[PDB]
C-alpha cells in the first residue's frame, strides 16, 4: 500500500485514540468547576467529534483551562487528520492523471 | 453481591479525626467516580465530594466548611473519606456511592453512622 | 449550582391511588434528572434515570417524565412498599446537587 493510504489510515486511527482520550480528560479537567457542563463521558464524547470535525454547535464546550488545552488537541488532531484524507485523495488524483497522460 | 462495603458505625471524640472507608466490588471502569454523601437525621442528602481512583483526583462542595479529603487504593479496591476536627455538627451517617461517569449513583454503601461525642 | 425544589415536602394519598412528586430545576437541566427512594432506616435506591429511563428491578409501577426546569416521578396504583422518602438529582452541571426530598404517606 502506497504511503498516502497508509499515512490516512493511521491518521483516523490515531484521531480515534485522541477523541477518546481527549472525551476522558476533558471530564477530568472540568468537574470541579462549578456550571460546567462536559462532565459525563457520553456526552464528553459526543463534544470530541463536533469539535474535531470543527462544528462547534455549541451545545458543550469546556471553561477551565485544561479543558480548554485538551479541546485545542482535539481541534488539531480533527483538521490534521482530514486534512491528511485530502492531501492523500490529491495524490491518488495526480497518479491517475499522470497516467491519462501517458506518463 | 454487595458492590460497596462500609463499617457500620465510627466514634470520634471531639477533635479528633476518623478515617472512613469503602470496599467495592463487581465490575471496575477507568471511568468510576465514587461519591461521599452526609445526611444527618430526619434531613436530606448532602453531597460531600467525589473522587476517580483511576487517576486519583477529587473535587468538593464549595457550599460547606471543608471537612473531608478523599484518597482510594487501587489495589485493595478502596476509597477513604478522612473527616479532620469534628464537632457535633459532623454527627451524621455518611454514605459511600459508585457513579459510571455517567451523572447517576447507581449504587450506595449502607453507610456509616458516625456520633462525635466524649 | 442548580437548586432543585421539591414540593410538596409531604404528599397523602388513598391506597391504589396514582401519585405525583415534583422536582423543578432553577434552570434548565435538559433530561439530566434521577429519582432515589429511601425507605426509613435504608440507604437511596436509584428508580428513575434520565428522567423517565427505567431501571431493571424496579416495578413497572414506576415512571417519570418531564424535560426542562420540571420533573415528575409518578406512581400507579400506590401500595405500602412505596412509604418511603423520594429524591431527585441532577447531574447537567457541577455540582451534582439534590432536591430536598418528598415523604410519601398513605
Known amino acids: 500500500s502506497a504511503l498516502h493510504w497508509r499515512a490516512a489510515g493511521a491518521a483516523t486511527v490515531l484521531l480515534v485514540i485522541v477523541l477518546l482520550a481527549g472525551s476522558y480528560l476533558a471530564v477530568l479537567a472540568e468537574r470541579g468547576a462549578p456550571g460546567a457542563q462536559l462532565i459525563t463521558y457520553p456526552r464528553a464524547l459526543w463534544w470530541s467529534v463536533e469539535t474535531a470535525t470543527t462544528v462547534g454547535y455549541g451545545d458543550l464546550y469546556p471553561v477551565t483551562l485544561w479543558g480548554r488545552c485538551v479541546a485545542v488537541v482535539v481541534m488539531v488532531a480533527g483538521i490534521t487528520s482530514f486534512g491528511l484524507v485530502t492531501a492523500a485523495l490529491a495524490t491518488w488524483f495526480v497518479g491517475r492523471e499522470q497516467e491519462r497522460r501517458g506518463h | 453481591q454487595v458492590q460497596l462495603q462500609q463499617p457500620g458505625a465510627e466514634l470520634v471524640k471531639p477533635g479528633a479525626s476518623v478515617k472512613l472507608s469503602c470496599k467495592a466490588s463487581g465490575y471496575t471502569f477507568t471511568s468510576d467516580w465514587i461519591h461521599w454523601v452526609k445526611q444527618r437525621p430526619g434531613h436530606g442528602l448532602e453531597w460531600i465530594g467525589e473522587?476517580?481512583?483511576?487517576?486519583?483526583?477529587?473535587n468538593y462542595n464549595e457550599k460547606i466548611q471543608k471537612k473531608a479529603t478523599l484518597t482510594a487504593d487501587k489495589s485493595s479496591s478502596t476509597a477513604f473519606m478522612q473527616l479532620s476536627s469534628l464537632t457535633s455538627e459532623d454527627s451524621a451517617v455518611y454514605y459511600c456511592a459508585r457513579e459510571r461517569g455517567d451523572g447517576y449513583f447507581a449504587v450506595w454503601g449502607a453507610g456509616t453512622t458516625v456520633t462525635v461525642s466524649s | 449550582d442548580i437548586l432543585l425544589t421539591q414540593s410538596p415536602a409531604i404528599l397523602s394519598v388513598s391506597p391504589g391511588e396514582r401519585v405525583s412528586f415534583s422536582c423543578r430545576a432553577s434552570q434548565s437541566i435538559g433530561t439530566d434528572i434521577h429519582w432515589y427512594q429511601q425507605r426509613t432506616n435504608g440507604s437511596p435506591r436509584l428508580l428513575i434515570k434520565?428522567?423517565?429511563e427505567s431501571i431493571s428491578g424496579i416495578p413497572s409501577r414506576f415512571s417519570g417524565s418531564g424535560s426542562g426546569t420540571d420533573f415528575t416521578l409518578s406512581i400507579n396504583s400506590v401500595e405500602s412498599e412505596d412509604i418511603a422518602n423520594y429524591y431527585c438529582q441532577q447531574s447537567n452541571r457541577w455540582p451534582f446537587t439534590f432536591g430536598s426530598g418528598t415523604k410519601l404517606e398513605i
Open positions: 473522587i476517580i481512583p483511576s487517576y486519583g483526583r477529587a
Open positions: 434520565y428522567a423517565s
